[PDB]
Amino acid sequence: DQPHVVVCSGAGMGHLTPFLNLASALSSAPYNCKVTLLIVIPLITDAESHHISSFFSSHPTIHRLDFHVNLPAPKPNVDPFFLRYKSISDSAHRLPVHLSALSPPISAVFSDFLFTQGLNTTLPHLPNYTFTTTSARFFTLMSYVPHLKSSSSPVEIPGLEPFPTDNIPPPFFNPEHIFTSFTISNAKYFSLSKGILVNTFDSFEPETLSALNSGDTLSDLPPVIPIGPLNELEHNKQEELLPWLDQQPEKSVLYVSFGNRTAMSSDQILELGMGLERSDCRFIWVVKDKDDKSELRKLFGEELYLKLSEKGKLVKWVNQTEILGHTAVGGFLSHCGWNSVMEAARRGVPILAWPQHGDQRENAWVVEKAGLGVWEREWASGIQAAIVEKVKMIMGNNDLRKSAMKVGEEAKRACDVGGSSATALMNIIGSLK
Ligand SMILES: O=c1ccn([C@@H]2O[C@H](COP(=O)(O)OP(=O)(O)O)[C@@H](O)[C@H]2O)c(=O)[nH]1
């Protein structure tokens, strides 16, 4: 009686992570499905491949299905990942033969946005749940892209707060930019998906979600269903910073990380370093071979590098979830990629938001609206002052600490028994039996 479901992931670490979390959750109680996880190969980065094989090693019950799509040749002035995304969207029409061979016959697919057109035209009788990896707020923008036909005036979707022009990726106004092309092709088929799953929870984006599900946006979207707080994955490889964290005072450490996609120049990193050193706060900072200091000594110079190392840790990689969950961490300076927002929210960690792109600026606004954090809109205009001023607020202001804590309590409730997200996901799986 146990449903066989397919999780159809795309490319790029930020998009794979929630799909791996979802596959893990569905293969486990209380869902207890048989899960086939589809991987698009070949993988673009070594990090992606590393994380996937580690996932299957630690989740032996989940079946791996490789979907080979030829890598496109690189082009001058075209983002490699966009070319890869486009490659993947263009091959989704091939999925039917591969998904139909699976045994036992599958009950549903949970798919990346890039597969939407392929799945919903070629497999119209199979429930397809489109799983977006962004905020409900930014997803709404993406679904409206076919209707953008003013390149420089805010976009007003009915029932939602307008999207200011400087938070919209400028490609969105050119129908033939490569990113816009596969965005339009797949958003045009959202109407045929059984639902849109979002890694968010009702109390985190209540006005966006109620507007979407009341009909106010006047879209033909299916129901938009928050399923998050998604449970994060156990990494066997242990975090070498947890004993050091155990010796810092509660809520005294600022965690600094700008994601997989960071667009920060050496000069920006240097000013951030100068700013953190002047703040004298303790910190863990992911900058950019894990044991190499030499680049950091070159970047900061010896005196600043040593002053920074007296108070914090400059590292290449951490188990983010383990760091954010530690009692000693009092704040999170983040680019506001949606995975990092959700992880932080799950832990009630106040966020200082320095977004770099369009979806991150919208996510930063969601973070501020929920009381999870504060968005420094012009952080790039004065990096040292922005960090000196706001770190003392992120780590000392009791109102933001208490509102971020309530966000964490609501995030825990949502993914607990009877929570709004757990119920939603259980009703989907129950509908398959
Ligand atoms: O040292 C690190 C830095 C980041 N992350 C993870 O990388 C992801 C970043 O995704 P996000 O959406 O936040 O940003 P993106 O990389 O896509 O820009 C998160 O899940 C983090 O937990 C991590 O595990 N260790």
Curated annotation (Swiss-Prot):
Residues 260-261 are annotated as: UDP. The active site is at residues 15, 112. InterPro entries: UDP-glycosyltransf_plant (IPR050481), UDP_glucos_trans (IPR002213), UDP_glycos_trans_CS (IPR035595). The keyword Glycosyltransferase applies. Keywords: Glycosyltransferase, Transferase. It catalyses: a 3'-hydro-2'-hydroxy-beta-oxodihydrochalcone + UDP-alpha-D-glucose = a 3'-(beta-D-glucopyranosyl)-2'-hydroxy-beta-oxodihydrochalcone + UDP + H(+). An anthocyanidin binds at residues 15, 77, 358. Changing residue 134 to A: Decreases affinity for phloretin 2-fold and affinity for UDP-glucose 4.9-fold. UDP-alpha-D-glucose binds at residues 14, 17, 133, 318, 320, 335, 338-340, 343, 359-360. Optimum pH is 6.5-7.0. UDP-glucose-dependent glucosyltransferase catalyzing the C-glucosylation of 2-hydroxyflavanones (2-hydroxynaringenin, 2-hydroxyeriodictyol and 2-hydroxypinocembrin) and phloretin. No activity with flavanones, flavones or flavonols. Exhibits C-glycosylation activity toward 2',4',6'-trihydroxyacetophenone and phloretin using UDP-glucose as sugar donor. Can use UDP-galactose as sugar donor, but catalytic efficiency is 14-fold lower toward UDP-galactose than toward UDP-glucose. This is UDP-glycosyltransferase 708C1. It comes from Fagopyrum esculentum. The gene is UGT708C1.
